[PDB]
């Protein structure tokens, strides 16, 4: 799921197609909004929620096979995936609803942190080799600003 294209515009739009049964819709909406805010905080990018399939980043929760040729694997393992910039499915973010979605310390996975990571992918970032960076391919909950200098350097290099 690695690509070589970046968005040719900075006013990015996203559409929350559906939701997970683990969290209230208001909490989900807010987690996604806060995740995007992390990236717009260090770049000239903006993220506007829309209600149309024409959004750049379409967000959906799915289980096992869900359309694209990359079905989820149930509890744990693959948590989600996002397609790099481009038209159509490109740029979209899919979350495995077989996971226990939560926030903060505790069991389950933070939808906030995972979304922030997935949106990094949706923006064209690849994985980071820095263990403490958000783009590091390993889920670990920790307090503190999600973006590491490496993440900031990486996203600014693109936008
Ligand atoms: O697009 C991706 N990219 C990933 O690296 C992914 C994942 C998604 C989001 C993550 O959030 C995160 C990243 C850094 C710090 C805190 C939280 C961490 C890991 N990991 C999850 C763990 N996954 C893995 N798990 C078990 C066996 C093999 N691989 C590798 C991919 C993922 O689910 N989707
Ligand atoms: Ca900004
Ligand atoms: Ca798209
Ligand atoms: Ca899974
Ligand atoms: Ca779930
Ligand atoms: Ca949790
Ligand atoms: Cl729904
Ligand atoms: Cl926040
Ligand atoms: Cl959190
Ligand atoms: Zn998918
Ligand atoms: Zn990743």
Domain chopping of the chain, boundaries: 1-159
Cβ atoms < 10 Å from Cβ of 72: 22
d(CA 87, CA 57): 10
Tell me whether residue 35 is exposed, middle or buried, using C-beta atoms within 10 angstroms of its C-beta: 0 to 12, 13 to 18, 19 or more: buried
d(CA 133, CA 146): 8
d(CA 35, CA 133): 15
Q: How many residues does the chain have?
A: 159
| Ligand 1: residue whose CA is nearest its atom 20 | 137
Asked: is 1-159 a CATH 3.40.390.10 domain? The reply is: yes
Which ligand number lies closest to the CA of residue 45?
Answer: 2
β-pairing, 46-49 vs 11-16, is: parallel
Largest CA distance in the chain: 39
Cα of 64 vs centre of ligand 4, distance in Å, is 8
Asked if 101 and 109 count as a contact pair (C-beta separation under 8 A), the reply is: yes
144 φ/ψ sector (left φ>0, alpha ψ -120 to 50, else beta) = left
Terminal C-alpha separation, the chain: 20
Q: Residue written as tokens 């790099």?
A: 84
Asked if 117 and 110 count as a contact pair (C-beta separation under 8 A), the reply is: no
């Amino acid at each position: 799921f690695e690509g070589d294209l970046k968005w040719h515009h900075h006013n990015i739009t996203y559409w929350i197609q559906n939701y997970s049964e683990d969290l209230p819709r208001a909490v989900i909406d807010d987690a996604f909004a806060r995740a995007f805010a992390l990236w717009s905080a260090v770049t000239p990018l903006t993220f506007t929620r829309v209600y149309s399939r024409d959004a750049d980043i379409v967000i959906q929760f799915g289980v096992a096979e869900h359309g694209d040729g990359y079905p989820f694997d149930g509890k744990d393992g693959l948590l989600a995936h996002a397609f790099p910039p481009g038209p159509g499915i490109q740029g979209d973010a899919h979350f495995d609803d077989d996971e226990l979605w939560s926030l903060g310390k505790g069991q389950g996975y933070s939808l906030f942190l995972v979304a922030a990571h997935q949106f990094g992918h949706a923006l064209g970032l690849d994985h980071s080799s820095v263990p403490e960076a958000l783009m590091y391919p390993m889920y670990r909950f920790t307090e503190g600003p999600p973006l590491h200098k490496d993440d900031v350097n990486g996203i600014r290099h693109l936008y």
